[PDB]
Design a binder for this molecule. Sequence first.
Ligand SMILES: [Zn+2]
Length: 860
Amino acid sequence: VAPPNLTREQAEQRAALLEVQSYAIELDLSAGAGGPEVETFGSTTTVRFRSATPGAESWIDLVAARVRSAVLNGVELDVSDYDESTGIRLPELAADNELVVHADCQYTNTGEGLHRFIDPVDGGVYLYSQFETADAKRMFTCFDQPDLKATYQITVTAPQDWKVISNAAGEVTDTGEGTRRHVFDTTKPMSTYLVALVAGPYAEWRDVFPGDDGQDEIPLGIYCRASLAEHLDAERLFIETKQGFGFFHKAFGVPYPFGKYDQCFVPEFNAGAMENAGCVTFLEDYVFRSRVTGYLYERRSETVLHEMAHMWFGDLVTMRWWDDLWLNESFATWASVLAQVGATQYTNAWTTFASVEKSWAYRQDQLPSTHPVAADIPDLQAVEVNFDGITYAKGASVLKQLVAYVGLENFLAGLKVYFDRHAWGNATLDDLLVALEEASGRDLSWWSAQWLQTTGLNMLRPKLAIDDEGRFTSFSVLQSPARPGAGEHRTHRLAIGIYDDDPATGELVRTHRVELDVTGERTEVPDLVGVHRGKLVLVNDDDLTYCTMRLDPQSLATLIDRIADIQESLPRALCWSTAWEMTREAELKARDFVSLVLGSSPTTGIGAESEIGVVQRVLLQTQTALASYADPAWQPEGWRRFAGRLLELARAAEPGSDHQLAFVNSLAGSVLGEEQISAMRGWLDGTAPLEGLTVDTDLRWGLLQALVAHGAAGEAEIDAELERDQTATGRRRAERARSLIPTPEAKEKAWQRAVHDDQLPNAISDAIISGFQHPGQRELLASYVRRYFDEIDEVWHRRSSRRAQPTVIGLFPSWAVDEDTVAVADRWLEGEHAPALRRLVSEGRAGIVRALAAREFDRS
Ligand SMILES: [Zn+2]
């Protein structure tokens, strides 16, 4: 028995019948600062709502340990058969209704509902809420669906040393008995999944965004655990926050809709961040206790602006049902990057987007599970696995392209129409399209039909002919049918770039750029006729569209021979992305990808790449190419080449630089030989340092984990390290290290605990899974292929979707690239399984099929 799996039709039935005005929520957290045995908190809800049909029956949702009382219009309801799957039935409704429910809800350690964590350092007890998708019902009684918006008035009694943060500002008074009562202002209307509670002895920083241009002042707060406060770069975070608030109200024509804005770094968080209105929560990894590269700063800033963007895209206007989640996530992702480029130091963020996030979109779109951006979601279980590379990155890429197509001025004017119309309410795909059509004066139905309602990618490549002076005599862009999918040819607004040698530096620079609408199978580009072809043609120059870009033969030979010579970072990153995707798609051999990346000198390959985020991403891709895509006979040689070159690059890198750190961190994830192991041990212990590399708390763990993985360190060294870092983060990092121990005994202990131990908190179970795989340990892991398929149904049955996913995705035998693994998956697929589980298993199988084709391609 479990919380409900609300269906689309059930949601529609409640929305047709009900209209909710208000919730008043009273939480008794007075016992919350007690020990690990404290199980429940008091939850009292008063909900005021209308029924269109007096006399009808409905139901409201609640996941609680006990319902003490439930009283509808003053009539006591029989809750003797309450269970969390059925909520509370509501018979004989009146036109106007008031329901009051007193219940004991449960704290979790799963990152769902009201999560409770105890800090081992100082004994501080920290709570935070996480309600998206449908976990609001674990804190208060509610119609837990996004189209029944209401106002919330939250009052909390808490241990007196706790701060309490919610959606709105509040007033606090002493109770006289060791607690404080926090009475929050009534919120603006919002969906249940956006209600927030963060409570504990969090460290606090305050600032203010001054009132500007019709937007009132915004009080700003930052919160984190007291034991982490010395590491929080508050000044930098407030600067980035205020840059966002200046940008978005100008862009959208709509001031920040909530009164204040708090950002809380919370323990044991499951995602990157969550856009609770006025009270955004973040993964603690973004509090940098150790030194990180510039890419992590950039990705944190992206996340900050993503969540700020949702204040409009999701919080002000919300999808009507989960099939339109993309209205929240695609738009927030697009707007985050638009803001980075427009308002922050991260003016390169479209390069990062092309390299990192688009690669996620491609992979997602090519799985057998591929779905349109505007998805079909029959129930909550279907959405729980749909926060994916299509809902986020493909959607964002399609929107970037829609901007290119209609123009930014028209697109922003359309957003203003949309926000003004649907403010404090819900919207669909149709509503968004109508707003955009109104602002642009264009029909976009056909556009939506081919771009938002379809799956797959179109390949785009130049077809050209040149005269004896190298000038084009003809030029067209060929478009392939959309795959995987329906095979349609789309309209793309794209640019073609021609690149040739700059006489002064010898680097490849853009000589010509032609932008046009490409349609159908072939589109001539007559303005390129007569132009010298140069050395490199890019038909998605400036990355305007969503496609599979490919090159003509001369251009591809230039990429292979001279990628580092590309002057500008964006077209160079598009070239790195092309090479990678060709590898994934069995068009470039893995060994050829590895050779491109490794280079052969200081000015060739990835060691010459200036953009740190591209360096990190390309290195991770190379490690995938080696383990998954290279001919098994060549893998050992490929790893020796990689490890040897990365040690050279690390030793050659500028002391203290981000490049130096990236190379070391890449070595720490690789299959290593004795020469690299011994170097790494000397860095860790400091008896033979790498000049300028500061081995700080988290780099010590990263190097020790690599040593453990290779059998060069063991449990005693892990235990000794945990003594040096006696923190909750240390416990997690020690768990990853213990899963990496390369023995059968160790691997079985790790499997048993990951799969079966439901007492461990989310973050620990996940850290255990995160050390299970390693590219040097394939032979140990081969003992788990049948184990996985034979045991995953029972995991899925026992854990929530959100808590089973790490096991399903993370223990899938992606290491076992063999037709035998495909046959085992095939037999599993012939059985009966939950649809969302089947989806995830098929995705893993598809990974194996893609790797087999790549391996055959690399074979020489
Ligand atoms: Zn988001």
